[PDB]
Design a protein around this ligand. Sequence first.
Ligand SMILES: *[C@@H]1O[C@H](CO)[C@@H](O[C@@H]2O[C@H](CO)[C@@H](O)[C@H](O)[C@H]2NC(C)=O)[C@H](O)[C@H]1NC(C)=O
Ligand SMILES: *[C@@H]1O[C@H](CO)[C@@H](O[C@@H]2O[C@H](CO)[C@@H](O)[C@H](O)[C@H]2NC(C)=O)[C@H](O)[C@H]1NC(C)=O
Ligand SMILES: *[C@@H]1O[C@H](CO)[C@@H](O[C@@H]2O[C@H](CO)[C@@H](O)[C@H](O)[C@H]2NC(C)=O)[C@H](O)[C@H]1NC(C)=O
Ligand code: RAM
Ligand code: RAM
Ligand code: CA
Ligand code: CA
Length: 338
Amino acid sequence: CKITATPSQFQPALLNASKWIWTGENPIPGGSNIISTRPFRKNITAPCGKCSVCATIVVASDDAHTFYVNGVRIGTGAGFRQGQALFVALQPTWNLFAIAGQNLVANSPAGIMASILVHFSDGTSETFVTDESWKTLRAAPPENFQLPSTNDSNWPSAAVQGAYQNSVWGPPVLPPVLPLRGSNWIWTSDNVNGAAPVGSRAFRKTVNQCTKVAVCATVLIAADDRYTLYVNGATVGSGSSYTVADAYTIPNLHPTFNTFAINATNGGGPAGVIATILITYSDGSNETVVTDASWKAIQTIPQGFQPPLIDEFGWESAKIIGAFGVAPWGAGMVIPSA
Ligand SMILES: *[C@@H]1O[C@H](CO)[C@@H](O[C@@H]2O[C@H](CO)[C@@H](O)[C@H](O)[C@H]2NC(C)=O)[C@H](O)[C@H]1NC(C)=O
Ligand SMILES: *[C@@H]1O[C@H](CO)[C@@H](O[C@@H]2O[C@H](CO)[C@@H](O)[C@H](O)[C@H]2NC(C)=O)[C@H](O)[C@H]1NC(C)=O
Ligand SMILES: *[C@@H]1O[C@H](CO)[C@@H](O[C@@H]2O[C@H](CO)[C@@H](O)[C@H](O)[C@H]2NC(C)=O)[C@H](O)[C@H]1NC(C)=O
Ligand SMILES: C[C@@H]1O[C@@H](O)[C@H](O)[C@H](O)[C@H]1O
Ligand SMILES: C[C@@H]1O[C@@H](O)[C@H](O)[C@H](O)[C@H]1O
Ligand SMILES: [Ca+2]
Ligand SMILES: [Ca+2]
């Protein structure tokens, strides 16, 4: 229950050990199936002596899926060529994962594949996957099939349709951990006419939903020249590339108030910092924060620019240099896989 895990480099959930599953209505795996919707459930328990905190999920489907965690709809998606990234807070000892899969083309294959990378309170992680231990039904999902109160003890086992490397679908591409589409390159307002002075600049963003309980954050960040990233005053990481982005996991968020602070440095010419942050809440919801004009910025970095509760007098609104994609940096940022 005590969280000794600390901020770390983001660890990708992989699909390599995962299996495609369906109902087995057609006993040929990868065989033709009817248009239909089918349920899939798995109760996963935390190993002895650890608490589960949150999970990075990658899910792929032929043809479409709706993903639930402990009764809460977490995401909807479709397609088997590229997986979908989802993030969710978890109960400490067990968690019910439920998926409604849909086959949308008659006489065509059908399948659900997911990988669930659970992070534990002690800083360790374990991947769980769709396989034959999941429960299903040869029928449309009952009402409230995804709720933990539904009893699945008399459900049949899911039928494996294929493996990551051996299936009709081939191996799905991992999505990026988080999008940079939707974020902006920002800087202090001394950034004009495509260049900014040499020097360091600081940026701050606070999230404070005092009626919710925040659990984990995933951060994706890049800066033209370099950055150091802080959360609630603690150093998270640093980078020096505007073509290869860095991803971090913050597993020990404060429950209600969290401040992200950045020291970014321009070595000459253009400058900018860009980031996308996803925070998970204990009720299963999430929120995304992006670098934009709601961040604060300052041109001379004061002592203790990174502590959570400083006086922000004399900080300006950060300037939007451009949405992700603009010249000179373009759209080709290398982003870690989800
Ligand atoms: C965060 O939670 C929300 C809902 O709880 C999810 O976003 C909405 O639901 C669908 C499901 O993927 C999104 O595609 C839409 O963009 C959202 N609805 C809108 C805009 O009306 C989202 O899946 C969750 N993110 C996670 C779990 O990473
Ligand atoms: C998932 O599994 C856990 C553990 O097997 C279930 O939790 C147990 O439920 C029984 C019956 O209510 C309790 O007596 C135990 O104390 C619980 N054990 C633990 C470790 O919590 C849980 O009910 C299952 N969830 C679902 C949705 O089936
Ligand atoms: C902000 O970042 C810059 C660069 O990362 C820091 O400036 C460096 O300070 C180190 C001390 O560790 C010195 O060795 C160098 O003079 C600087 N290096 C570079 C590359 O500029 C700066 O101290 C950071 N913090 C603040 C508050 O400005
Ligand atoms: C793999 C196959 O591809 C197309 O025919 C359709 O997407 C169909 O639903 C799917 O099963
Ligand atoms: C886009 C531009 O490219 C070079 O001039 C340098 O790497 C500089 O730091 C960067 O801003
Ligand atoms: Ca299909
Ligand atoms: Ca530069």
